Amino acid sequence: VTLCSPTEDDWPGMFLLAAASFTDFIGPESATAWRTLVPTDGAVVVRDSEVVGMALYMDLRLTVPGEVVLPTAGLSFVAVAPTHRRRGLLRAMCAELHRRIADSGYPVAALHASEGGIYGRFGYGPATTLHELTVDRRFARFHADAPGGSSVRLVRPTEHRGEFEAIYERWRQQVPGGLLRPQVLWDELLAEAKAAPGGDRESFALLHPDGYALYRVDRTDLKLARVSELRAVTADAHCALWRALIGLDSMERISIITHPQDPLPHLLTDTRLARTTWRQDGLWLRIMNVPAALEARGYAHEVGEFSTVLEVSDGGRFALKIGDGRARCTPTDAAAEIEMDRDVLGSLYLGAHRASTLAAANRLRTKDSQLLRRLDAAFASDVPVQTAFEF
């Protein structure tokens, strides 16, 4: 059992482990596009010889509150062979990649979790929330106040790549949770827009100057349209796209994976028709450098200047001063007024979870309720946190 950066000779063994571990992993061509985002020394393997564990990170750009873009290490392709469970391989691979990520200068790492109970203990906190809305479009009527009461076109996705790329780039720079989507991932997205024999139906696009929706009819439920992606930069675009989707007269239901502040339900005379059918953690964050992360993000201007001492368990103790939408985080040995594990800070960081909610579970400990109200307000995001794309 040894832990190494893989050589080219290791990749067939990594693709066998991948196929056996991930039901979405078709075969080696599955990985080509994503591999271009893995830096030199971004991957570790464990050999017993054969490959019994693997983990890597990709170079990403994540938008955080204040429209600040952070270099982010996206952990992905993590697998332990079913023959090698409970032998400390995940712990060993995560410790080595975290050493490399921190030494390389990334202030944050991120991942999407296969189960909820694994990554907390490695300092990742869930930072975005996925909300599935299912609309019974047969009853849906737009409110008299709704915008746009056509600027939308029904198009073939492959013929409008340029326009999708440009709208997404505007959206990802404005919204916390936004990720830069490189060219190779647009290649993969547009390849999945094709019908497959025995697989997905063809995807169609609704295109507005300031938004798009990509949707396909369900494989088996022919009265359900699933919107894979909806990116809108303006309220007018968001409403115009939903008017077009509610015009899919052959469907009974339209489902989308969105965020908890999606305004859709308020566009309709009956808010109850936009039903929440599923909710789950989206992106998880591990803050790698506490002061660099806290200083980088913008904070709410509504809260007056305040100072506190924050201790992150095994993460340092810092004097935190927040004023004029900005934070100064400096080392101190003064008594801590707030204490939390690293994972909790990652949950607070994009505004998805309130400090006072975490305090009520004792995940965040303070004796000052005023300080809690001030952190709740300051860490809030003006623009609601969304989830970009899974990795």
Ligand X SMILES: CN1CCC[C@H](n2nc(Cc3ccc(Cl)cc3)c3ccccc3c2=O)CC1
Site for ligand X in 38-67 (CB under 6 A): 38
User: Using the rule CB under 6 A, is 306 a contact of ligand X?
Assistant: no
CB 281 within 8 Å of CB 113: yes
Give the HSE-up count for residue 61: Cα atoms under 13 Å, Cβ half-sphere. Answer: 11
- The answer to whether residue 391 is catalytic is yes
Q: Are the C-beta atoms of 148 and 243 separated by less than 8 Å?
A: yes
What φ, ψ does residue 282 adopt, rounded to 5°? -105, -100
Pick out residues in 252-271 that bind a second copy (CB under 8 A): 260-261, 263, 266-267, 269-271
> Quick one: which of 273, 312, 338, 350 contacts a second copy (CB under 8 A)?
273
Is there a catalytic annotation at residue 168? no
Task: Confirm if 171 and 212 have CB atoms less than 8 A apart.
Answer: no
Residue 212 phi, psi dihedral angles, 5° rounding: -145, 155
250 is a contact residue toward a second copy (CB under 8 A): yes
5 is a contact residue toward ligand X (CB under 6 A): no
User: How deeply is 323 buried, as exposed, middle or buried, from its count of CB atoms within 10 A (0-12, 13-18, 19+)?
Assistant: middle
Q: Which stretch, 29-37, 54-62, 109-117, 170-178, contacts a second copy (CB under 8 A)? A: 109-117
Listing from the earlier edge strand, what are the strands of the sheet with 43-47? 2-4, 43-47, 51-64, 68-80, 108-112, 283-287, 125-126
Residue of the chain from 5, 6, 35, 323 that contacts ligand X (CB under 6 A): 35
The footprint of ligand X on this chain (CB under 6 A) covers a number of residues equal to: 11
Pairing, β 108-112 against β 68-80 = parallel
Q: CB of 233: closest distance to a second copy in angstroms?
A: 12
Question: Which residues from 28-67 bind a second copy, rule CB under 8 A?
Answer: 48, 50, 52
Contacted entry of ligand X, a second copy, none for residue 199, CB cut-off 5 to 8 Å set by kind: a second copy
Q: Which of 77, 119, 168, 349 is catalytic?
A: 119
Annotated binding site: 78-80, 86-91, 114-115
Partner that binds at residue 267, options a second copy, ligand X, none, CB closer than 5 to 8 Å by kind = a second copy
Report 64-83 residues binding ligand X (CB under 6 A).
76-77
Give residues with Cβ within 8 angstroms of 64, minimum separation 6.
Answer: 70, 176, 296, 297, 349, 350
- Going by the annotation, the residues of the binding site for acetyl-CoA are 78-80, 86-91, 114-115
Instruction: Give the residue numbers marked as catalytic.
Output: 119, 391
Binding site for ligand X (CB under 6 A): 22, 24-25, 30-31, 34-35, 38, 76-77, 391
